[PDB]
Amino acid sequence: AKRTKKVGIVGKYGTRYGASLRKMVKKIEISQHAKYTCSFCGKTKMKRRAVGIWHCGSCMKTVAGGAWTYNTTSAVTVKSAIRRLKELKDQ
Amino acid sequence: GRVIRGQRKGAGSVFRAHVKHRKGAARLRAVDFAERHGYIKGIVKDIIHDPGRGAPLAKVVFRDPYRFKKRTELFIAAEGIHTGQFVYCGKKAQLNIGNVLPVGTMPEGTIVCCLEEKPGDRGKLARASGNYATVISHNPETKKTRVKLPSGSKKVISSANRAVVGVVAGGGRIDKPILKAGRAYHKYKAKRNCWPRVRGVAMNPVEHPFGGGNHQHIGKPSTIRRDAPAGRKVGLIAARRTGRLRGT
RNA sequence: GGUGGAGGUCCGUAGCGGUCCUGACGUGCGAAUCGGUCGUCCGACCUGGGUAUAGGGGCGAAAGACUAAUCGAACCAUCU
RNA sequence: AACUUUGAAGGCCGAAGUGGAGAAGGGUUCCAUGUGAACAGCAGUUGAACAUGGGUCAGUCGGUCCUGAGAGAUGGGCGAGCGCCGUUCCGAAGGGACGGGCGAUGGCCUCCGUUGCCCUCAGCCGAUCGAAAGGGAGUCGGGUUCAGAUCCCCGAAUCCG
RNA sequence: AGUUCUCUUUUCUUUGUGAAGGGCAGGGCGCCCUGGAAUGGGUUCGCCCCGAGAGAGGGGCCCGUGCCUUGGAAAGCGUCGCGGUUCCGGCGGCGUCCGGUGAGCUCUCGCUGGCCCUUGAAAAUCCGGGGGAGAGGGUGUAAAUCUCGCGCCGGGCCGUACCCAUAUCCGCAGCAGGUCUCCAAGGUGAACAGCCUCUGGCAUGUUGGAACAAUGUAGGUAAGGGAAGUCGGCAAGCCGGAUCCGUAACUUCGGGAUAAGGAUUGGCUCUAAGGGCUGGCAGCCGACUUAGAACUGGUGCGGACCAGGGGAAUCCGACUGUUUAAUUAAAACAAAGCAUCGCGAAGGCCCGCGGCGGGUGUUGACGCGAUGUGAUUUCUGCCCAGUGCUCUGAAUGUCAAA
RNA sequence: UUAGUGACGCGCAUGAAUGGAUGAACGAGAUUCCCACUGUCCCUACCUACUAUCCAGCGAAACCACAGCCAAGGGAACGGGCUUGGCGGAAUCAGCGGGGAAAGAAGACCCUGUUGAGCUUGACUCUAGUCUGGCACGGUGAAGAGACGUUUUUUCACUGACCCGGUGAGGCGGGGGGGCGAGCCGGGCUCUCGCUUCUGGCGCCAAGCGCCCGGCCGGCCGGGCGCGACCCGCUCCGGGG
RNA sequence: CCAAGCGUUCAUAGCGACGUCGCUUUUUGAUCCUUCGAUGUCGGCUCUUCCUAUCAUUGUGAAGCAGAAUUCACCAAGCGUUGGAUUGUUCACCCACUAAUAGGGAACGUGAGCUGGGUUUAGACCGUCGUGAGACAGGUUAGUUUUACCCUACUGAUGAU
Numbered sequence A: 001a002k003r004t005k006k007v008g009i010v011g012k013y014g015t016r017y018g019a020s021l022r023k024m025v026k027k028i029e030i031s032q033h034a035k036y037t038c039s040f041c042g043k044t045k046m047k048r049r050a051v052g053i054w055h056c057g058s059c060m061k062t063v064a065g066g067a068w069t070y071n072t073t074s075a076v077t078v079k080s081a082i083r084r085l086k087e088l089k090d091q
Numbered sequence B: 001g002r003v004i005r006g007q008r009k010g011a012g013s014v015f016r017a018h019v020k021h022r023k024g025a026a027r028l029r030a031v032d033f034a035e036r037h038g039y040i041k042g043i044v045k046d047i048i049h050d051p052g053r054g055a056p057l058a059k060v061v062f063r064d065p066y067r068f069k070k071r072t073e074l075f076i077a078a079e080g081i082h083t084g085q086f087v088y089c090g091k092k093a094q095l096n097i098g099n100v101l102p103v104g105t106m107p108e109g110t111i112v113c114c115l116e117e118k119p120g121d122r123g124k125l126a127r128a129s130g131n132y133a134t135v136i137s138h139n140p141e142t143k144k145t146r147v148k149l150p151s152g153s154k155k156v157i158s159s160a161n162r163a164v165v166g167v168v169a170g171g172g173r174i175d176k177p178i179l180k181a182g183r184a185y186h187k188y189k190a191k192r193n194c195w196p197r198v199r200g201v202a203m204n205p206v207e208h209p210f211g212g213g214n215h216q217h218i219g220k221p222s223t224i225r226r227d228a229p230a231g232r233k234v235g236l237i238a239a240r241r242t243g244r245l246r247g248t
Numbered sequence C: 001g002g003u004g005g006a007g008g009u010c011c012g013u014a015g016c017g018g019u020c021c022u023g024a025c026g027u028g029c030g031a032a033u034c035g036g037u038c039g040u041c042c043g044a045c046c047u048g049g050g051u052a053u054a055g056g057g058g059c060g061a062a063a064g065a066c067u068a069a070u071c072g073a074a075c076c077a078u079c080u
Numbered sequence D: 001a002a003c004u005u006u007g008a009a010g011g012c013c014g015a016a017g018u019g020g021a022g023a024a025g026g027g028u029u030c031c032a033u034g035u036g037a038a039c040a041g042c043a044g045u046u047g048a049a050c051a052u053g054g055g056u057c058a059g060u061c062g063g064u065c066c067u068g069a070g071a072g073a074u075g076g077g078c079g080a081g082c083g084c085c086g087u088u089c090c091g092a093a094g095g096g097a098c099g100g101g102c103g104a105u106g107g108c109c110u111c112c113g114u115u116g117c118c119c120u121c122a123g124c125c126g127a128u129c130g131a132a133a134g135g136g137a138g139u140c141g142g143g144u145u146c147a148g149a150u151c152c153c154c155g156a157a158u159c160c161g
Numbered sequence E: 001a002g003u004u005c006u007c008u009u010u011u012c013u014u015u016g017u018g019a020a021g022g023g024c025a026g027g028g029c030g031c032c033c034u035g036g037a038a039u040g041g042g043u044u045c046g047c048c049c050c051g052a053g054a055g056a057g058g059g060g061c062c063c064g065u066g067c068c069u070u071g072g073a074a075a076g077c078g079u080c081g082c083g084g085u086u087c088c089g090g091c092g093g094c095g096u097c098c099g100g101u102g103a104g105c106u107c108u109c110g111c112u113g114g115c116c117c118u119u120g121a122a123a124a125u126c127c128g129g130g131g132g133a134g135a136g137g138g139u140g141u142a143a144a145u146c147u148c149g150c151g152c153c154g155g156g157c158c159g160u161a162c163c164c165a166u167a168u169c170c171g172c173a174g175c176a177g178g179u180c181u182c183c184a185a186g187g188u189g190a191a192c193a194g195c196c197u198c199u200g201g202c203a204u205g206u207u208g209g210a211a212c213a214a215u216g217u218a219g220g221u222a223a224g225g226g227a228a229g230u231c232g233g234c235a236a237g238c239c240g241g242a243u244c245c246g247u248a249a250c251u252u253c254g255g256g257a258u259a260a261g262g263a264u265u266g267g268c269u270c271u272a273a274g275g276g277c278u279g280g281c282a283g284c285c286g287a288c289u290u291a292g293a294a295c296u297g298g299u300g301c302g303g304a305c306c307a308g309g310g311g312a313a314u315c316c317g318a319c320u321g322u323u324u325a326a327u328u329a330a331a332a333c334a335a336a337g338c339a340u341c342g343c344g345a346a347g348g349c350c351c352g353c354g355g356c357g358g359g360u361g362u363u364g365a366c367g368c369g370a371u372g373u374g375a376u377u378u379c380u381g382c383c384c385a386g387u388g389c390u391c392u393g394a395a396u397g398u399c400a401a402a
Numbered sequence F: 001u002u003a004g005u006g007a008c009g010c011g012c013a014u015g016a017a018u019g020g021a022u023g024a025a026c027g028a029g030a031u032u033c034c035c036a037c038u039g040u041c042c043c044u045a046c047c048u049a050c051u052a053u054c055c056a057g058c059g060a061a062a063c064c065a066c067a068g069c070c071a072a073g074g075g076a077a078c079g080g081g082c083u084u085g086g087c088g089g090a091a092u093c094a095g096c097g098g099g100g101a102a103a104g105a106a107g108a109c110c111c112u113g114u115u116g117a118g119c120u121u122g123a124c125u126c127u128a129g130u131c132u133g134g135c136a137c138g139g140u141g142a143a144g145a146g147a148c149g150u151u152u153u154u155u156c157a158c159u160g161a162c163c164c165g166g167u168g169a170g171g172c173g174g175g176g177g178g179g180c181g182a183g184c185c186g187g188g189c190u191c192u193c194g195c196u197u198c199u200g201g202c203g204c205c206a207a208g209c210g211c212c213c214g215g216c217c218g219g220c221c222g223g224g225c226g227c228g229a230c231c232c233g234c235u236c237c238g239g240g241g
Numbered sequence G: 001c002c003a004a005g006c007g008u009u010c011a012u013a014g015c016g017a018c019g020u021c022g023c024u025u026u027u028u029g030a031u032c033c034u035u036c037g038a039u040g041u042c043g044g045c046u047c048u049u050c051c052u053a054u055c056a057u058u059g060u061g062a063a064g065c066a067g068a069a070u071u072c073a074c075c076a077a078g079c080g081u082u083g084g085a086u087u088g089u090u091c092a093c094c095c096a097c098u099a100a101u102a103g104g105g106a107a108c109g110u111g112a113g114c115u116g117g118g119u120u121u122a123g124a125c126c127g128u129c130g131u132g133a134g135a136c137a138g139g140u141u142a143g144u145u146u147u148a149c150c151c152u153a154c155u156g157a158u159g160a161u
C-alpha cells in the first residue's frame, strides 16, 4: 500500500526542517542510496561507501565519483572534453 | 577589554586541526628523471575517505626507478578513476583522466586538478572536491601558461608545473542541506574547533567591538579598514562594497 | 492487505538535569541540602582517567559565565 | 546492661540491594588479646578509640615493554641573561652485519672459536618520555589461615629464554 | 528437612568436573569438483543469490567456550555410621540419576543489514610469501639441515592486608552532599517500574521512657455549593493500564492524535483456532496465546501497586540542543537556512620579546578566515547627503626625514 | 471586565536580513476563556505519624552600657530612666509575636572625597602592530634620457649575496655517439628523438664480451680490471633576485 | 460671619454672590530638626482599638413637613456599615443585596504576622534617545522574604504574703 502521499523517503524527518528543504534533500537522499549498475561487471550492486566513493560488491571495484550520484554531469562532460582534446593533440 | 575569540585562534591551543585520523598529506610525486623526460606507470590500489576532507584520496603505487621498492603515493582522486586502473605521470603521459602531465604539454582548455602553484611543489591549486582549473593559453617563448582557477582568477604559472587531468571527485557535496545542527556538529568534529559560532553583537563590549548595548545592534559601521589592529578587525574586512550582488 | 523498522521521533526506567510548591530547612543533615512535582533519556547523549590552554591571560552554544567555596581581572610573597 | 554476646520471635533492604567484589583516595583503619582514663554529642562489658603483639609470599595477576593526545634533549636559531623556540627543521646524525681477505691468540689445539685490521652490504629520517581501563606470550583445580593466597601446600599444565 | 486437627504419592534444600591434549557434535564459509539453468529457479523475519555458473549431488577448510575422553575420583559435595591426639587433608557405607521446554533473562560466537558533508588509533611484537646468494655428501658409522616427538637448565625487581562508602575516600566530623565500575533469584507485570519474597545482610541511622495541649512539618477525609478564594486555580484534586469503537479545526500532508467522546474489564466452567516428531492417514509429544459462550457475586472487578485532565484562543521562539555551579531555564544563546566580506600562498586571518619562529595547515576557493540575519512560506521598498569602507591617480593643494 | 479576542488607525515613538507578514509541529516560556475537578473559598471540623510537651543522661549558640509596667509633658521635635500623675508583692511554667525605633552587616539608595575600578568614545597624553620614504647590507652588463673620461635617473637583462620549493640532494649544462624524417649536388646539414600505454603479473644484489693475475696437476680451481653503464664541467635541481 | 440675590411672593424652609474670619492635618507642598557602624520600602489578607467632621438605628427640633418619600439641625460613636466582575493597585467604576452600604487615626496601624502582584539589583525583549558604553516617574517577562530560647506586654498555668 502507498503509505505516504508525497514525502517519500524524507518522511523520516517528520514535520521538521521545512517543506522546501525536505523536498530538496529528498532528491539527494534517493540518489545517494540507489544501487547503480556496475560498468565493470554489470550487476546492480554499485553503492556509496563514503562521500565520493562508490564500491561494487560483486567485482569489488571502487570508483571516485560524485558526492550523491555515481558520476556528476560536470565530470561526464569533462571526460568527453578530454577525449576530444586528446585527438587534436595527436590528430 | 579582553582578547577576542578571533585573536585566540592563532595561538593553537584548542584551535588546532583535528588530524588524529587523517590518512596523510595528499601530493603528487616528487619530480624526478622519469617525469622530466618520459613517464612512469602506477596502479590505483584503493580510493579512500580522508576525515575532514570532502574529496576522496587515491592510493597509487609505483616502482622506485633506482631501488627494488614500491612507492605508495596519496593522490587527490580525480572523478572517474577506479581501483586497478593504471595512471601515468610525466612529460610524455597521455591525455587521460588521472594522468599527471606538465601543463605546458596540455592543449588549451584542458580541465586539471591538484595543480602545482610553483614547479616542483607537488600540487596546490584546485584540490577541493569537485573543483578544477583550466588551461587558457601557453607562451612557449617565456615558458609559461595561463590557468583559470576555481575562484575565477587567471594566473600565470610556469609551464613545467604538473597537474591531474580531470576534476576532483565528490562534486556537488554542497547541494545537500545539512538540515540539522547535529550534522554540522559532526562535520567540524572532524575538521577543527570552529563550531558553533557566537555572534559579536551577542557578547559584551569587553570581548568584542560589536558587543554590548541595550539593543543587539552593531552601533558602528561593520566595514573595517584593512590596517585595523588585531582585535579590532572584525565584521566586513576591507569591503569594497556591501549588500546584494545584483547583476554581474 | 501484509512485511520492514527510519527518527538530533513520542511515553517512560538507569543516567543526566533542576520547573513549581516562591514546600522543608534557614545558629541547617548541607558555607546550596531535602521531598513531591518536573525536563530529557540514540544523541548537539552521559561518564572515568590521560593530555593541552594560566591572569589583562585562558576558556566561553555568550550568563561577564567559569578559571580549587575566590572573578566586571584568581591566588601567594614582596614593594609596604 | 534499653544499647554487648548467644537463642527464640517480629520486621526491614528486596538482586539498579542495606548483598559479593574492585579502580581512585586512605595508609594499618586489617587480625588476635587487653582497658574501659580521654574519644565514639545517652550508655557500653562495645568500637575504625587506646595498649601490646601479628599479618600482604607469583615466570603465568598487574607494573615492567609499545605507542596515543602530547611532553622533551642534541644540531640549529634566538636570547642582556636564568634560558626560550624548536622535533626533522641550517646536521659528517649508522659503532651494525651475512659473507670475503688478512694477521694475533686460544681450547674438547684433531679443527674449530675468540679477538684486531681491511674489503663488502645497510633508508629509515629522529634521543627520550607518555596509559595499574588501549596494544601486550604464558595457570588452572582441590586444600589450607586469627588475619594471605590464580601467590602457600597437593595435583595437573603452560609461555619464554 | 518441614507440615500432617483435616488434606497433601506433598513443600523446601541438594543432585561436580578445571587448564592443556585427543575425538566428535554444532555453527560458518565471498572454498573446490561434476554440470549447465526461462514454464526462471533457490531463499530469509528482512533480504538476497545465479551463464562472471543457480538448483542438485560429492568434497575442503575455520571456530568448536558444547559433549565424551586422559585429567578424574584418589578430589569435592550430599547423607548415615564409627573412630582418634581428640585443633587428625581421620576412617568407612550409599549417592553424586533421567527427561522436557522457552520472542524467557545474562554473557558470548556468527550471519545479514541500516547511518554518516561523522568512516570510527599508532606503535611495539609475531607470521606467511616471492627470490635464490649459498651450504651440504658422494652411495656412506652418509652430510648440511629440521617451525616434528621426547629430554635438560632458568625466569631476577616492584605492588599485593583491609575499606571502597547513610562510619576506613573529599566536604573541619562516623556530615541525608559528592565520588569510576563488575555479578544480579521467585511472584505480579510490557518491564532492570512499583509491591511482597529466597540467598546474603541489617538493627531504624549520634539516645531512651511517659504523655497525646496549643502551634507546627508530612499525610488523609469532608455534608450542600463549586474558584464565590487569590495578582494568578498557587495547592490539591479530576484523568490514567489494556481491549473494541470513534476522532475536528488546521497542516509544511509528515502530523494534530492517547485529539475529543463512548463501551468493556472480576471469579469460575467450557468451546474454537493457532504446532513438532515418527511411520489428505495413524500414533505420540507441546507452549503460550487469542477469540467466543454459559454460570456467578450487595455493579464489585487496570479492586493494592503502576498509571496523560481536557478544549477554544492570543504573544514569543520554528523545532531537538545550551545557559547565569549558589535568587533569573527564558522570548536570551546556539542552530539549519539565507546574505554579505578577505584571500591564489612572497597570500587572508591570527599568535609571539625574539628567529630560516608559530596556528588555520596532513589546508587550497565545493577551502580557510570575518560578520549579520535566524527553519519553511511570501517578501525584503526609497536614500550614497552624514559617518564608515572601498577604488584612480603626478593631472595635483598640503606633506617628515634624507 | 483598567483583563482577553476581533476590528479601526494622522502610529507621542510600527515597518522590511538594525529583517516585515505568517504559519503546521514543538515549549517545566507569557496571557484569556470554557468543560471537568475539587476544602482555594463559604466555614471550618476530625484523624494519623514526627515534633513541641514532661522525665533520665548529655548539652551549645546569637546577644548583653545599666536595665526592663504605663499616660501626658518637655526634650535631638516618637522615654525603660527625667517631670507630674497612674501605681508597684517572691520564684516560676507553656505559649505569643505589640514593643525593646530587637538581632544580623561601619547603608547597596542619595550626596561628598581633588578615593577608585570594569566599559566606551569625537576626551587629553601616549603605544604594539601596520602603511609609507630615506640610509646600509647591495653586486654585474647593456641601452634611453640628462649634467660636467666621471656622475643622477628610467627601462631591459645577468647572478653571486638574499629568499622560496623539492629530493634518500639520483642522470643538470655543453659536446660526442646512434635513429626517423627533410632536401643540396654517396656525402653534408636545416632539425627531431633517446627504446616503458591492453590485462589489478614479474622486475635489485649483471648476463655477455675483452684484458691480465694467482693456485694445483694444456686440464681443473680461484681472483682483479674495462666495456656493458659515452666524454668534460664551477654552483644538487628548479623558482625568484 | 455680612446679605446682593435665588427660592412665583418672601434675604436666612433650603441656598447664597461680592467680601471676610477660622478649624483640621485622613491631600499635596515648603523646610531638612532626628535617623545613612541601616527604624525592612506600596497594596492586599488578618486582628484590636480609638475619633466624629453621623450613612443607618434610638430620642428630638425645623421645612417651600397633608400622607408617603425626602431635606436641614440637636443630644449621640451603643451597635452596624456587606457579596462580587476589571485593576498590583490606594483610588476608580460598575453588578447585586441591604436599615445603611458614613468618613478617618493608631510610625500614611499591622513583612522575626503572611503574601510578593507592583516598585526597586543582577538575565532578556520592544519603542524613543545616544557615535558608543549605555539611558528612560516608557512598556514587558523571569527573578533567595533570615533569627526569638532573652526582657517586657499579653494569653492561659503553678504559686507567694
Ligand SMILES: [Mg+2]
Pocket: B202, B203, B204
Ligand atoms: Mg549578553
Ligand SMILES: [Mg+2]
Pocket: B001, B205, B206, B208, B209
Ligand atoms: Mg572594545
Ligand SMILES: [Mg+2]
Pocket: none
Ligand atoms: Mg527523543
Ligand SMILES: [Mg+2]
Pocket: C010
Ligand atoms: Mg521524550
Ligand SMILES: [Mg+2]
Pocket: none
Ligand atoms: Mg532555577
Ligand SMILES: [Mg+2]
Pocket: none
Ligand atoms: Mg523555599
Ligand SMILES: [Mg+2]
Pocket: none
Ligand atoms: Mg525552622
Ligand SMILES: [Mg+2]
Pocket: none
Ligand atoms: Mg561537546
Ligand SMILES: [Mg+2]
Pocket: none
Ligand atoms: Mg597571549
Ligand SMILES: [Mg+2]
Pocket: C061
Ligand atoms: Mg558551552
Ligand SMILES: [Mg+2]
Pocket: none
Ligand atoms: Mg550584563
Ligand SMILES: [Mg+2]
Pocket: none
Ligand atoms: Mg565485603
Ligand SMILES: [Mg+2]
Pocket: none
Ligand atoms: Mg562492596
Ligand SMILES: [Mg+2]
Pocket: none
Ligand atoms: Mg558518650
Ligand SMILES: [Mg+2]
Pocket: none
Ligand atoms: Mg576491626
Ligand SMILES: [Mg+2]
Pocket: none
Ligand atoms: Mg607454583
